[PDB]
Write a protein that binds this ligand. Structure first.
Ligand SMILES: *[C@@H]1O[C@H](CO)[C@@H](O[C@@H]2O[C@H](CO)[C@@H](O[C@@H]3O[C@H](CO)[C@@H](O)[C@H](O)[C@@H]3O)[C@H](O)[C@H]2NC(C)=O)[C@H](O)[C@H]1NC(C)=O
Ligand SMILES: *[C@@H]1O[C@H](CO)[C@@H](O[C@@H]2O[C@H](CO)[C@@H](O)[C@H](O)[C@H]2NC(C)=O)[C@H](O)[C@H]1NC(C)=O
Ligand SMILES: [Cu+2]
Ligand SMILES: [Cu+2]
Ligand SMILES: [Zn+2]
Ligand SMILES: [Zn+2]
Lengths: 152, 155
C-alpha cells in the first residue's frame, strides 16, 4: 500500500503551518494547507530534494529535479518537479494553499515523501527574469521554514 | 560525479532540551545500520521506535503508534514477534549523551517495511519489550510519553 496522503509541518518562532498532499485524479496531487506568519504578499514554495534538517533548511538541497529541467512556473513543461510556484499571504498574515499538481507524486520517481517543503523569503519569478538566479531558484531568496514530507 | 552512493535517511530531534541526528544506511543483506548521537537526557535507557505516521501536526502524538505492517505484538528488537518499528532502548551516559549504533533486520529504506516518511520517537522511559504485566506492555512497551520526534527524511 503506497500512501494516499502526506503532510509537511512548518514550525518556527514566527511561522506555523501544515501542508497536506493527497493523491487524486489522473496522476495528480492535491496540495492543501494553511500557514501563518508572513506579511501580505507572494513567497516561493518548493519541494527540495533532501529531507535532511541536520543543517536546518540549507541541508534540504536544491529544488527537487529528477528530470534535470530548468526552473519554471508550475504550468510550464520546462520546470523542476518541485516547482509549486508561490504561496500568497493575505492581510491577516495567513496563507491558504489549495492547488493541484501533476508533476509531483506520492510514489515512484516523482515521489516527494521523505523530501522537504521550503517556504522562501520572497516571491519566485518562475525562471522569467534577467536576474542571475532566475533559472535555478527563481530568485526566491533565503529559506524561512521547511518541513520533511511525511506519511499521513 | 564520484562513486554513486546508495539511499540513506536521517531524522533530526530538536527540542529545548534534546538534540540529535539519527542516520539509516542500508548494509549487507538488506539490513539497516542506524547510528548517531542524542544529547539531553540523564544516564539511563529510553524507548526509541519508528512510529507509523510522519505527521507532526499535533506534535509527537500525531505520529501514531509503532510502525507495524505485519500486525505483530510489541517486542524486543531481537524477537520475531515485534513491530517493525521496535528498535529498542537507547542508552544515555553520565554526560547526558547517547551514542546510537545498531544494525536492525526488520526496518528497510523501501518496500513495505520502508520507514522513509515515518517518524522516530524518543520516549520518556525505558521500553520493557512487551515482557511485563503493565496493561500497555504488548503494545507500547510501557515507554510512556514522547519526549522528541523527527520525520525520517531522504538523506
Ligand atoms: C548533526 O547535527 C549537527 C547540528 O549542529 C551538525 O553538526 C555540526 O555541529 C557543529 C558543532 O558545533 C557545528 O560546527 C561548528 O563550527 C564552529 C565554527 O563556527 C566550530 O568552532 C565548532 O567546533 C564546530 O565545528 C555545526 O553547527 C554543525 N556542522 C555541520 C553543519 O557540519 C551535523 O551536520 C549533523 N550530522 C550529520 C547528520 O551528519
Ligand atoms: C495544523 O494542524 C494542527 C493539528 O490538527 C492544527 O491544530 C488543530 O487544528 C484544527 C483545525 O484548524 C482544530 O480543529 C484543532 O484546534 C487542532 N487540533 C485538535 C486535535 O483539536 C492547526 O490549526 C493546523 N495549522 C494550520 C494553520 O493549518
Ligand atoms: Cu527553493
Ligand atoms: Cu513508541
Ligand atoms: Zn525550481
Ligand atoms: Zn512496538
Amino acid at each position: 500500500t503506497t500512501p494516499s496522503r502526506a503532510i509537511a509541518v512548518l514550525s518556527t518562532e514566527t511561522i506555523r503551518g501544515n501542508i497536506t498532499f493527497t493523491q487524486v485524479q489522473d496522476g495528480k496531487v492535491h496540495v492543501q494547507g494553511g500557514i501563518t506568519g508572513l506579511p501580505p504578499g507572494e513567497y516561493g514554495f518548493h519541494v527540495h530534494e533532501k529531507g535532511d534538517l541536520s543543517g536546518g533548511c540549507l541541508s534540504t538541497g536544491s529544488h527537487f529535479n529528477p528530470e534535470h529541467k530548468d526552473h519554471g512556473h508550475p504550468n510550464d513543461v520546462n520546470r523542476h518537479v518541485g516547482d509549486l510556484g508561490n504561496v500568497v499571504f493575505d492581510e491577516n498574515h495567513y496563507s491558504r494553499i489549495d492547488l493541484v499538481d501533476d508533476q509531483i507524486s506520492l510514489s515512484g520517481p516523482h515521489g516527494i515523501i521523505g523530501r522537504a517543503v521550503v517556504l522562501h523569503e520572497k516571491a519566485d519569478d518562475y525562471g522569467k527574469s534577467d536576474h542571475p538566479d532566475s533559472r535555478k531558484t527563481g530568485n526566491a531568496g533565503g529559506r524561512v521554514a521547511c518541513g520533511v514530507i511525511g506519511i499521513l
